């Protein structure tokens, strides 16, 4: 029970009316408007028909770095955005245990 029933403040409350969004925005995808997203946008199912290719053409690879344009369009590159990932928290920032010289 995360909701503040036990320790009670009158001011914290559910968003009963459209007026007063002012006091907060949704943070997760589950907390959202019915047709919306955590940010203010219309939900898109993100599934479409991949352009069919020739059998001589090599097939698509799943583990490539995602295209740089894709990340920026979601907006996650900006530090203010919630989902941001700090560069200090990368696994590349560690001394790897398997390396002999370390």
């Amino acid at each position: 029970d995360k909701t503040k029933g036990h320790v009670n403040q009158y001011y914290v409350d559910k968003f009963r009316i459209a007026s007063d969004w002012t006091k907060g925005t949704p943070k997760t995808q589950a907390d959202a408007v019915l047709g919306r997203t955590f940010k203010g946008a219309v939900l898109v199912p993100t599934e479409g028909i991949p352009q069919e290719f020739d059998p001589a053409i090599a097939p698509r690879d799943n583990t490539v770095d995602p295209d740089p344009r894709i990340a920026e369009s979601e907006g996650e590159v900006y530090p203010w955005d919630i989902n941001y990932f700090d560069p200090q928290f990368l696994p590349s920032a560690y001394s790897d245990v398997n390396d002999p010289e370390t």
């Binding site: 408007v33 946008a41 344009r69 907006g75």
Partner: protein
């Protein structure tokens, strides 16, 4: 800078496939909301200077140390710059409201604005208080049933509040 449509298209090209029927149905939905969107932006631009002025008066009424001696806004010049910053943030919120995506507002307004307010010594937290005031006043004007046909506008108001929360997020 991308709109909603550019964003949908840019993702679909990064995967490199055609759009499905489901996606195009969702875009039909976005167009059907498009008139209401233009209406809200008309209300914000049509009363923008009273939003900036009223929210500035409430700013200086709440904390009185932005206008006193030693305050960042104490000089006539620095007061003019203060009301400028509020007008600019309102301007980019107007842009990102029409676009549907906040790529403009993230690109031009809030990119290294934090380190600028470091380098000037301006309290960024007080700027977040100002942006809270423009959010409250402009949402209060966006919900106004005046000269405008009847319907529902809750999702679009929630979108607008998301944009102001990006502004107040990144100035601090």
């Amino acid at each position: 800078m991308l709109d909603a449509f550019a964003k949908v298209v840019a993702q679909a090209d990064a995967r490199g496939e055609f759009l499905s029927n489901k996606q195009l149905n969702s875009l039909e939905t976005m167009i059907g909301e498009g008139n209401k969107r233009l209406d809200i932006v008309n209300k914000i631009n049509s009363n923008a200077s009273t939003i900036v002025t009223n929210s500035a008066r409430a700013l200086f009424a709440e904390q009185p140390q932005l206008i006193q001696p030693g305050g960042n806004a104490y000089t006539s010049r620095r007061m003019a710059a203060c009301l400028r910053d509020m007008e600019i943030v309102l301007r980019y919120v107007s842009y990102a409201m029409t676009a549907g995506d906040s790529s403009v507002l993230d690109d031009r307004c809030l990119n290294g604005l934090r380190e600028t307010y470091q380098a000037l010594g301006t309290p960024g937290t007080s700027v977040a208080v100002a942006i809270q005031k423009m959010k409250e006043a402009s949402i209060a004007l966006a919900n106004d049933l005046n000269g405008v046909p009847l319907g529902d506008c809750s999702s679009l108001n929630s979108e607008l509040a998301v944009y102001f929360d990006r502004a107040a997020a990144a100035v601090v």
